[PDB]
Design a protein around this ligand. Sequence first.
Ligand SMILES: O=c1ccn([C@@H]2O[C@H](COP(=O)(O)OP(=O)(O)O)[C@@H](O)[C@H]2O)c(=O)[nH]1
Ligand SMILES: O=c1ccn([C@@H]2O[C@H](COP(=O)(O)OP(=O)(O)O)[C@@H](O)[C@H]2O)c(=O)[nH]1
Ligand SMILES: CC(=O)N[C@@H]1[C@@H](O)[C@H](O)[C@@H](CO)O[C@H]1O
Ligand SMILES: [Li+]
Ligand SMILES: [Li+]
Lengths: 359, 366
Amino acid sequence: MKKIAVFTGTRAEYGLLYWLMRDIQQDPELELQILATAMHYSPEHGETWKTIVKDGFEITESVEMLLSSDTSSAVVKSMGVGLLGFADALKRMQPDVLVVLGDRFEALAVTQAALIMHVPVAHLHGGEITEGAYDESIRHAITKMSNIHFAAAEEYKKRIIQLGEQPERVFNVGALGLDHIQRTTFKSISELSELYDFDFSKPYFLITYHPENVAPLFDALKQINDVNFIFSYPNTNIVKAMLDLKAQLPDRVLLVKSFGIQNYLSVLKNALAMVGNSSSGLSEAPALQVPTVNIGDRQKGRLRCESILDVRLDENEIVEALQKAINFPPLGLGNTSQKIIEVIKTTDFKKKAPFYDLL
Amino acid sequence: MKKIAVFTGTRAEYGLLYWLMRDIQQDPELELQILATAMHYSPEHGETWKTIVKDGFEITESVEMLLSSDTSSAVVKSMGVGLLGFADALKRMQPDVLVVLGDRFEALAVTQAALIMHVPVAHLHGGEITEGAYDESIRHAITKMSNIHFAAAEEYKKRIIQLGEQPERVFNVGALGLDHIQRTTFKSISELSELYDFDFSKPYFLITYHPETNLLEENVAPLFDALKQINDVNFIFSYPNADNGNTNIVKAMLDLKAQLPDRVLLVKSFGIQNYLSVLKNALAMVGNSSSGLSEAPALQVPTVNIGDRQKGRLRCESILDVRLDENEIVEALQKAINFLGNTSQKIIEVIKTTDFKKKAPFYDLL
Ligand SMILES: O=c1ccn([C@@H]2O[C@H](COP(=O)(O)OP(=O)(O)O)[C@@H](O)[C@H]2O)c(=O)[nH]1
Ligand SMILES: O=c1ccn([C@@H]2O[C@H](COP(=O)(O)OP(=O)(O)O)[C@@H](O)[C@H]2O)c(=O)[nH]1
Ligand SMILES: CC(=O)N[C@@H]1[C@@H](O)[C@H](O)[C@@H](CO)O[C@H]1O
Ligand SMILES: [Li+]
Ligand SMILES: [Li+]
């Protein structure tokens, strides 16, 4: 029996890790541990650790860490509280593997804690490029302190190998979140229509825009005749906009508070195009044959493919892309969890492999 | 007037950083800040902050962090205490740059603290390899979180560039500590003997052994037994660092001291002037410290390097690599018996003439 602990610090990355957790839990020779922390214990986002429990999981260790503040000083303090809790949490859990996804500072924290305490780290989504204040640097630091690496694409695996990781320790397995696409039983147009009191049978745009003046977006959709607009929630700067557009056209736009992964993929499935700058637009929309118009550069650095139509944040260049989207796989198909588990079962990665020099 | 804050966690790195610190203090266009922490405030490692102050430097911010419990979980907790202190220290200092040397866990802590608080990091001694310690992965993580890089050799600079750092931010300026060869006057055998009440005129090994932190079950008896098998030489020890697993080494050192009181000198921490004075006259530098492969060859003193803590570093012909094995150590010892300094100024003018306020993009190799 191998103890596989999954680290989770936000609702979104828990969503991405969901099916790997389900598979470990189901697998009889693998014991699932869960270390939940950071924004799962934030009242701003409704204590999303409860969602983990409601989905059938047992939170093995929980570590409140986030300070109620907006300063970066308080982010450093939050990271310190995190390290203090992670020491005792890893001490009690004694995982054989710690699964860490992404590049948030609490994942950096737990990764270095694991390194010091000799818990092997399996890192997901290393080798990626997504410019920010410093999210990139942190991602690569996590890569350097991890023992095995599950990249989502070949460019990413190659960049991980350039970072000095042994090729036998890097695996292109696809994007784990896309397992949802492969395992969801989608709601029909009738079911979605009855559930949200809205006729999804008249085609629509699904639009998730996240805050990076968003005017040349909401002036860019008023022009598009004869389409309904289903929004998810991204904030008052854009929420106020979305609401203004609602009141102007009270019927042919629907704003939904929280879709949920199943309903969300069902509405995204039956859409002409995913509009906006969310990450859904650069992985889930391609896997669901629905074109994407990505706005601005919040998703700058992610790999592209046929379906992606990137346009700057101005009115005209958007209004063109919408119609062009009314005029019609590197991250994989969605069996990533099983590939990850097969590699974990068949590979020794207890120790950090020797640094890999190119040549 | 640019604010250059120098981070210092241990004696070792402080001595390495000395001439850079003194040159910034002396340079009237740069304001020296110092963030001292970790082993500088532990009585078990000498309270070496006193050395910093006595050298004429002002400790702008101090952060005690080291937990006394000798476990890996206590090391993690020490790093967390570090972060909680560095938050306020860096908040007040508002440095224009933070200078971080090396690969220890407190340096990882302060580097991520500075990154999160948008304080550019100048990292010294990146691109090297020390496979036997978790300092290895720490070092590459610190490289990825640093803005400008000062390496000690072209091989190391090249490894920094492979790590995805922009070429114009990686500089080969040499090892800063070796500036002590030209600018620091060495003590003589008589002054060392009066200063430590121990005769340095008799042949002696200088021994420094730290926990090899990737080794699962470190048992250091083969070294000390090996030392006991030698005749007519003295054993002068510095203390192991604060990594988990050091109290075992301290225990073995105290056992050896009680066994051979007239032949053993245990010093928690020398001044680096004193330390280089002792190393220069030793029969050999025994142990697994980084001085065995930079300072010790530079002073023409043979090195007996034990284990894998220094595995991967550049070698030369006076480096004797052995396993943690009684016979290999005894024989390397029997052999040992029987038988350019402008780095600081280069770093300073690079920091003066370069803009590294923002992390440069990831450098993909062709
Ligand atoms: O009402 C909603 C809106 C979004 N999502 C999910 O939230 C995830 C993250 O969305 P987004 O791309 O906006 O995150 P970001 O890219 O901004 O980090 C996606 O996988 C969606 O499936 C959801 O479950 N319900
Ligand atoms: O008692 C000592 C021992 C070390 N040093 C300095 O620290 C460096 C490295 O020694 P140490 O074992 O403490 O560090 P590490 O092996 O971890 O690099 C040497 O080159 C010396 O310049 C010192 O000043 N006093
Ligand atoms: C700082 C110090 O005292 N010792 C060494 C230093 O010589 C070396 O270059 C560095 C590698 O990053 O690792 C430190 O442990
Ligand atoms: Li299971
Ligand atoms: Li000065």
